[PDB]
Amino acid sequence: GVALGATRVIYPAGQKQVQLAVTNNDENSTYLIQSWVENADGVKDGRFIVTPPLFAMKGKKENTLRILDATNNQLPQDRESLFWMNVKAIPSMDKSKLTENTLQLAIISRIKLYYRPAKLALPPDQAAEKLRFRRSANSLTLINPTPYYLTVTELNAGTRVLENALVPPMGESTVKLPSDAGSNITYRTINDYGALTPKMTGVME
Amino acid sequence: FACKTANGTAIPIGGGSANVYVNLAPVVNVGQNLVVDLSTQIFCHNDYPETITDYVTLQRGSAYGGVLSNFSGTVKYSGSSYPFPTTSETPRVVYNSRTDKPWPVALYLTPVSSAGGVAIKAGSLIAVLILRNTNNYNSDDFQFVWNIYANNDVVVPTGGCDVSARDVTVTLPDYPGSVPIPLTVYCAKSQNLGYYLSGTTADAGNSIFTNTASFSPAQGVGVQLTRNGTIIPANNTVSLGAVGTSAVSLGLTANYARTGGQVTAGNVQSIIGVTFVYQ
Numbered sequence: 001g002v003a004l005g006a007t008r009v010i011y012p013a014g015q016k017q018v019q020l021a022v023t024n025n026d027e028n029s030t031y032l033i034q035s036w037v038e039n040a041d042g043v044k045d046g047r048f049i050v051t052p053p054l055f056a057m058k059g060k061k062e063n064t065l066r067i068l069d070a071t072n073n074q075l076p077q078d079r080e081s082l083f084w085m086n087v088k089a090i091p092s093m094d095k096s097k098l099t100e101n102t103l104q105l106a107i108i109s110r111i112k113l114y115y116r117p118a119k120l121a122l123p124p125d126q127a128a129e130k131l132r133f134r135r136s137a138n139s140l141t142l143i144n145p146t147p148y149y150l151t152v153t154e155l156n157a158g159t160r161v162l163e164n165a166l167v168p169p170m171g172e173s174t175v176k177l178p179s180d181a182g183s184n185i186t187y188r189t190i191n192d193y194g195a196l197t198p199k200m201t202g203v204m205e
Numbered sequence: 206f207a208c209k210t211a212n213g214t215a216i217p218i219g220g221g222s223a224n225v226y227v228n229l230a231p232v233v234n235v236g237q238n239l240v241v242d243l244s245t246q247i248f249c250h251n252d253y254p255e256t257i258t259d260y261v262t263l264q265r266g267s268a269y270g271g272v273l274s275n276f277s278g279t280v281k282y283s284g285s286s287y288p289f290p291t292t293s294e295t296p297r298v299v300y301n302s303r304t305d306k307p308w309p310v311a312l313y314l315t316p317v318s319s320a321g322g323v324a325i326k327a328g329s330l331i332a333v334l335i336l337r338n339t340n341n342y343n344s345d346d347f348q349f350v351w352n353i354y355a356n357n358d359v360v361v362p363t364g365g366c367d368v369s370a371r372d373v374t375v376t377l378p379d380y381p382g383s384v385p386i387p388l389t390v391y392c393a394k395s396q397n398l399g400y401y402l403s404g405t406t407a408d409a410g411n412s413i414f415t416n417t418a419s420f421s422p423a424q425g426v427g428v429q430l431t432r433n434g435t436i437i438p439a440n441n442t443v444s445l446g447a448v449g450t451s452a453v454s455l456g457l458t459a460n461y462a463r464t465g466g467q468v469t470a471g472n473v474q475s476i477i478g479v480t481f482v483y484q
């Protein structure tokens with residue numbers, strides 16, 4: 001089908017633009033590539049505009065998408081803002097299967113896009129450690145004090161495993177705590193390159 | 206004949222070896238290129254140019270660590286490229302001056318589909334290149350051994366997964382019928398996927414997709430997708446676990462479901478958007 005070069009995207013505040021790769025694997029089958037950027041609440045506002053807004057990839061191709069900053073510094077400058085980029089691949093209609101009952105699918109890749117204010121203290125590679133905790137016979141409230149979005153994964157209460165989490169900057173995110181816990185926290189995060197970071201042991205606050 | 210390193214380190218006549226440290230591009234995507242231009246850090250000169258001519262070659266070129274597992278490349282030696290790792294000694298270049306001129310060796314490395322996250326660890330041996338020297342004056346044959354060490358990590362961002370599927374499904378199975386929809390996903394690098402369907406709906410339960418058609422809209426029916434007997438309403442993310450090198454089938458079946466109370470002859474065609482969510 002059609003796949004994006006990244007699994008996420010980081011938009012550097014100030015950057016005139018940011019590029020993302022798109023490629024069609026199907027040796028023969030054209031597609032219409034529509035792309036847009038929804039915000040955290042999934043509302044298609046204008047904060048970000050992608051070009052080209054509409055185009056075709058006849059068979060194997062490999063074009064570039066350009067995310068354009070549209071929010072004239074109208075966003076939070078002390079931390080990241082979460083947005084969602086969607087790239088939809090529209091298949092052409094088969095003029096042959098006209099008198100037929102059909103169901104045509106349309107794949108869409110939806111990857112996170114983080115807006116990163118050009119000036120931030122704590123460097124990104126040094127944030128997945130600032131991750132503190134707080135437990136209960138129920139809650140295990142994650143708590144990211146940094147300005148970046150922590151994509152917590154492989155989070156285990158040591159004993160029992162757990163539900164992944166996306167802990168917003170300087171905010172928390174609760175997760176159920178199914179008894180089998182003890183205190184041995186073991187989690188891993190997904191970095192700017194969509195790669196897992198090293199295991200780590202939960203440090204309660 | 207002698208050579209010195211940009212950092213100043215030298216290997217006198219007779220040869221020997223030295224470390225050549227490099228700062229490689231921090232990020233390189235699959236299909237993209239990693240170039241280590243050594244013609245910037247290795248210089249050699251001819252000692253008695255007026256009467257002696259020097260012939261310099263790329264005797265061997267070996268890969269190590271990251272580069273050896275995460276890359277496939279060529280060695281461009283003086284306007285010509287050859288395989289890297291090298292399999293044969295290259296043509297000779299001449300050095301005829303006491304002034305340090307460059308050694309035109311450059312690596313063109315390309316991360317593979319399977320390249321990890323840190324395709325090259327910082328401080329690791331990236332390559333060892335052997336510079337050979339001879340001359341038209343005597344029978345001397347000396348080897349200069351350059352050890353290429355990477356100063357930083359070379360990261361190859363993980364790409365999106367691939368949704369293999371057989372085009373436009375023929376839900377022909379006359380009104381009552383129901384076909385299975387082939388659809389799998391294979392990620393070059395294991396990661397957790399999540400997907401949800403989107404499209405216009407026709408029921409309170411948001412699971413029967415409206416009939417979009419040109420010829421006689423067989424009013425009354427609609428298309429509902431199920432994954433192993435389980436209904437998939439629109440916008441209800443389904444955790445696919447973690448897709449890896451083995452394409453997981455979503456296990457979908459296009460089913461006819463009724464909307465209003467008056468099923469009626471005609472064609473039933475539908476358009477559904479499947480959205481894969483990345484972590």
Ligand SMILES: CO[C@H]1O[C@H](CO)[C@@H](O)[C@H](O)[C@@H]1O
Pocket residue numbers: 206207218219250251252253254257258259338339340341345
């Ligand atoms: C003494 O000769 C040295 O210098 C000449 C001129 O560079 C080289 O050709 C030769 O191989 C030796 O390195």
